[PDB]
Design a protein around this ligand. Structure first.
Ligand code: MG
Lengths: 104, 108, 104, 104, 105, 108
């Protein structure tokens, strides 16, 4: 699949690692590509590769670090946001940042 | 066994995958045949193959994503509904949608 | 061991499967032989094989689906009922149904 | 080691099985030898083999079914009883029954 | 390493076995050398070998049976006591008994 | 990677061992190199190797012993402190001590 890149900053990425899934309603739409520490904030910055076919995702969308069952692997849940039609189509594209994150 | 098809849309299908069981009172009556995420609604849509012998299931019946014990596999629980026969008899048939769905519950 | 057959209907048999134990105070007295869902009631019906040596079980006896510890297998707990001496001996025999069941 | 045999009835023996340890303050002093269901009471009946060197155990002593940690094996804890000296020395010997049990 | 011997009696040693660690603030300072059940008191008696370098531990120090995480091995935690020096300076030495013990949960 | 050394004293290091990670928001920035118990204070002293690229960590930063999930290994969490600009900028360098520590949390 061709993919596009999104960025997100979390206070804490817990057990999230590269190759961790990104899901929408529990369906895999992408992967964590990289995690590094922002030199300016010392907050972790995550790089996501989302599949190009999932490409009308509003900017108001949020990312949560979740675990699959009690003893499972960590993953990112993309919660697809409400978009006020009176404020256009603000859509996530290659290079954009998801502003709304939930850590730990 | 001959089967019939039902559809269901969830907000979140959690760890449900194709070939996941569909059960009534813990007895397997079907299989998840397909899961796709709708590119237009970003809601997951599940296709079920239910065995033809389980055939008088009211429309008011619900589907829940449950887990078998704490550390187990995810499955679909069909909770068989009520329709007052005196007020007309609405039954799930090949191609119908189950409207009442309960999504995977998370941490909290 | 020779066995006899008992039947029981539950709202929900959870993780119960064929070959699941039937126990009295945690001692194994039988096995689940079959589970079928009645198409007419949509209630699961369990067939049990109880060991012939445990053959003075009152009719008023009850079955519970329990789990063995936190992480364990599901089993059936036979709770041995009250036998009114003033009303004689009503005893479970090959083909009888245990009426009093507790699910999930 | 030579052993002596004690008997005990529980309402429920949970996960207890033959070869399960019997301990005093967490030290192994014997083994569960046998578990059966009493034909007369339908209560589980446990046979213990205590090492002969642990042989002045008062009859007021109790048995508890415990688990070793959350996810561990079930074992029997012998709690060594108070015996009023003014009412004699009543000691457990080969063949005796421990009357005070705690199940489940 | 040279070691010295301490004794301790518990009501219940739970899952403690010979070779079980003895730790101070989570650092291993010794080993359980022996466990016997006293046939006379039916109390378990634990023999410890503490490393000689850990050496001016007050008598008022306590031993606890703890578990390392939920699913872990049992160990002995030596909690180093206060002693007011003005009221005597009593130290655990080869052969001494730790009087203050806390038994398995 | 080149690393620099930091020291820290805890009341209790719990399950911390050599090669245990040091992390900042769950990203690994170093390793526990050594643990010794001071015979004089009976307080454990930890030696850390932090990667040289993480080198503007304020002195006011703190270390916590945490566990990764319910059943996981112990690690050190470096919580990056506040750096007052107005009175000048004190940074951890090879050989410095982290003063602010939080020990392994015990039975309830
Ligand atoms: Mg003591």
């Amino acid at each position: 699949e061709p993919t596009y890149t999104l960025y997100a900053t979390f206070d804490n990425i817990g057990g999230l690692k590269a190759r961790s899934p990104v899901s929408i309603g529990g369906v895999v739409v992408g992967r964590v590509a990289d995690i590094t520490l922002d030199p300016k904030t010392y907050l972790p910055r995550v790089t996501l590769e989302i599949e190009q076919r999932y490409n009308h995702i509003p900017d108001t969308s949020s990312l949560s670090i979740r675990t699959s069952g009690l003893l499972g692997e960590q993953y990112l849940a993309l919660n697809v946001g409400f978009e006020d039609p009176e404020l256009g189509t603000a859509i996530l594209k290659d290079g954009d940042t998801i502003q709304d994150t939930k850590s730990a």
